[PDB]
Design a binder for this molecule. Sequence first.
Ligand SMILES: [Ca+2]
Ligand SMILES: [Ca+2]
Length: 687
Amino acid sequence: SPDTSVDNKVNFSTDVIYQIVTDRFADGDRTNNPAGDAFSGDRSNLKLYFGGDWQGIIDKINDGYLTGMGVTALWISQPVENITSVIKYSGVNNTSYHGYWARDFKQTNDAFGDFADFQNLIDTAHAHNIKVVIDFAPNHTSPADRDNPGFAENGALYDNGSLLGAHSNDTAGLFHHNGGTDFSTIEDGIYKNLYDLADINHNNNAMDAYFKSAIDLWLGMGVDGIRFDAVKHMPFGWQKSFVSSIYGGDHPVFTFGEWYLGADQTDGDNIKFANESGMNLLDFEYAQEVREVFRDKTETMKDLYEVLASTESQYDYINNMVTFIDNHDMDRFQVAGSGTRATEQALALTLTSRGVPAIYYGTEQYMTGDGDPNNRAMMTSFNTGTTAYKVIQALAPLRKSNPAIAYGTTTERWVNNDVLIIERKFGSSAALVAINRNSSAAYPISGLLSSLPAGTYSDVLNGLLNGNSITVGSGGATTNFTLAAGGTAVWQYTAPETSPAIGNVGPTMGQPGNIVTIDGRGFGGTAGTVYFGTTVVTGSGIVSWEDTQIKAVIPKVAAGKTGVSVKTSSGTASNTFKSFNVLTGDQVTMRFLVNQANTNYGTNVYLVGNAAELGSWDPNKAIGPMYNQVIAKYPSWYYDVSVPAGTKLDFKFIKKGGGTVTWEGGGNHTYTTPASSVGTVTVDWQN
Ligand SMILES: [Ca+2]
Ligand SMILES: [Ca+2]
């Protein structure tokens, strides 16, 4: 019922995610272990199955390891049936232990368990107030060789046990046949194969229907979240259409993808994805920077806040960024032979910072290992006594109890090369966090100011990371203190809120009729009003209303970005959740093709149209730069776009380059979209 409930599938910023590589966590059932060349009994080959399964996860929930840590969500390997063949990559036998080589998206990987096992995991987690997130990888099936049907399992796709097709002799046209990508461009990485993985053709409506059917199965079993694999390698438009159908369905859930960024790197396409796909993202800008600051010491605390400020400017849904200090695709945070304070401080920052914190299994056991697959070693121990375990145990529950932590703004109160003091603020609640990364020097903190009410505040960590108590004056001035070497402390104030405050709205995108979840404080007990822009939602439009959460039906309002606000029963107004994307209606994915659109170097073709999904005639929101190498060749251009179903579209193409915009001549192109199917529309550039 409240915002913090395990029942809240759609919003995760009050949660702490624990990321499990299922095969490498705990073998709770040896009877489902693979055997022979596919299994590593002595764990000498990290590319074979070790035997970790869902029973193992269930066991660590029941025996208190996970629950005692204070984690409230598990993010697990893709649960679906994978290939069972052993593949000799680079002189070494490899398996599907990682779950990414699907063969049937409607069946389980029997190494992990059967469907009853999976239901048991869902129910056991939910009973313990833990949400479950699954990897889902609709980009591809499994390895295939163009010139050898006998390689691996030839990327074969089954549908509840019956053959849909394989990569060789792909008679139903389920796969792309453009070779492998060189990752040179996003287009190249989308419509060519990811390494040798048979690449799903989502412009084939058989595949659109198949994957919508598949995900509904898993959501019907009670899955609370989806982590999409390889979002950079599928069309933006197909994924936007895909998640909109989830949001319009019976089980809206939290979704996020992995779009990798290196250290010191920003990517505009990454930002557009997170802001406009309807899907959120792992926060690699955060992750890489925190590693630079604490692990490698290659950036200062001043650099750190600069990144926090810039992400704030870049991303529209800041409370949805999934933060972390490492994961399955990075070198382990802990460097072997190094101290543990770096880990403990990085964890404390992540747990108290904006977004959705995710912790990679074994981080709290200081597990080491550089590169794949060394970063995916078996869980080394279940010792509940490590400092890192205790850090998580102390801080993770604050995400549930202190709305400033879960939802609040972020403010810099103090900075030095080695010292950062951050303040979170939401309504009357606040949290103040101080970190000194220097293990050899303490720092006097003088003249520090805070939004904390006057009083004495003890460290939530109780000095575990050498923190201290503080005294706050009636003007907000913090009495001078010394922040100890390696110091980390958290001071907090939680108040009863009298004025309505919106902390998050999920999903961030929806067509009229979708049910959205509005989380926060001070909504009151009796139903008030919800607003999309100035459009009122009342009575039957209100699904439910309590003080920390409202569920509302998206009204028939004009499509486009708008602000969501509320008004209590006594007429008190709230803040606004900005940039909610109202869709025109149910979506389909449409491939747009334009022919004979020649351009000069530096000029690209874009798509614009009257629908909001087509940028509403705004050349600055034109869709593109369009693609012109793989699916179709220059001077033809193409793009796959999420557009309203059963709807007449008016559109034109434009050429943009060097600050000048040239529009197509003649009248608008017109096209009425399919009612439910993906489709293709092909037109000629009008001179
Ligand atoms: Ca097992
Ligand atoms: Ca692809």
